[PDB]
Amino acid sequence: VARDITLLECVGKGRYGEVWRGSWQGENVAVKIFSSRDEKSWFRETELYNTVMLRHENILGFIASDMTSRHSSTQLWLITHYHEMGSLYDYLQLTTLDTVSCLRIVLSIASGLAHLHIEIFGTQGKPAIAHRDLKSKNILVKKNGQCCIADLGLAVMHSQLDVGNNPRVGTKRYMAPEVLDETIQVDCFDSYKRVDIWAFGLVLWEVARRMVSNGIVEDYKPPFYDVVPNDPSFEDMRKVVCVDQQRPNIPNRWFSDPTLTSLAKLMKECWYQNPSARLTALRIKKTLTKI
Ligand SMILES: Clc1cc2cc(c1)-c1cnn3ccc(nc13)NCCOCCO2
């Protein structure tokens, strides 16, 4: 139960709500406290965790979920494993990477996303799932160096089409061109997997910037830092991604490193204007395993 949790420190704050480091039987756990405005995101992630027994080493580990609702008060809690190392967004602010740690991180993300995307049949199976709000701030760094994906509140599902009634929409900075120009095929499940692949390519660019090659590294920057203001509007991102068709700049240093060059090619194959030309999660994972 949540009754035996002591909230210790607020480790994250946003429009979704807050994330706290909590204590439970003397062990650290994370508690996501949703704002009442995000009730549908809490329920989606709960049914994904407790009805679809969704478990994978690169998906945030679910412990429990609780809601209490009364006149003048509503609480919505998600209790998960705590990762002291924090969000990949925070982690990349402080850390530089080498060849092994860079590929451990990005391969672990690819592995979790493929696990979301690929359907499993039978008993103890799972539908195909699209995240729809992947970004560096919803990926956590585990002690072993791998990552795990969090925030499945916007997931859509499909078996041989489940879209929520969720009024919240993805982070604008990471929205795919088909989302921004509204040509996305809403009734086609593969559209949502390809919106995920787009966002993954941006996360791939974020990680690669922090890997050192030949004694050079870039500071952390978000996708499109140079052409969009902080907290960009829908219109800001359409002008950049669709009209101007701009994409993240690839610094010259990378082409001197074989690994960073391989990731540059992978990045671009996530960024096609045409969603159908983008790689699949499984192909990305199969490539990273060989690289
Ligand atoms: Cl249910 C959930 C959502 C989530 C992050 C966590 C849990 C989570 C788990 N351990 N942990 C450690 C630090 C931290 N978050 C977490 N820092 C705030 C980043 O918040 C991103 C929101 O996504």
The per-residue DSSP string of the chain comes to -GGGEEEEEEEEESSSEEEEEEEETTEEEEEEEE-GGGHHHHHHHHIIIIIS----TTBPPEEEEEEEEETTEEEEEEEEE--TT-BHHHHHHH--B-HHHHHHHHHHHHHHHHHHHS-B-STT-B-EEE-S---GGGEEE-TTS-EEE---TT-EEE---B---------GGG--HHHHTT---TT-HHHHHHHHHHHHHHHHHHHHHTB-BTTB------TTTTTS-SS--HHHHHIIIIIS-------GGGGGSHHHHHHHHHHHTT--SSGGGSPPHHHHHHHHHH-
Domain boundary at 55, 84, 113, which? 84
Same domain, 136 and 196: yes
Same domain, 116 and 63: no
- Report the binding-site residues for ATP: 11-19, 32
| Residues lining ligand 1, Cβ inside 6 A | 11-12, 19, 30, 32, 60, 78, 80, 82-83, 86-87, 137-138, 140, 150-151
Catalytic positions are: 133
CA of 140 to the centre of ligand 1 (A): 7
- Provide the experimental method for this PDB entry: X-ray
**Resolution as reported, in Å:** 2.6
* Nearest CA residue ID for atom 1, ligand 1: 32
Domain boundary at 28, 57, 84, which? 84
Q: CATH number, domain at 186?
A: 1.10.510.10
Domain boundary at 64, 84, 104, which? 84
Same domain, 108 and 154: yes
CA of 200 to the centre of ligand 1 (A): 19
Same domain, 163 and 188: yes
For ligand 1, mutation pick of 7, 32, 46 (most atoms within 8 Å of CB): 32
Domain that holds residue 234: 85-291
The ligand 1 atom at the shortest distance from the C-alpha of residue 79 is 1
Report the domain count for the chain. 2
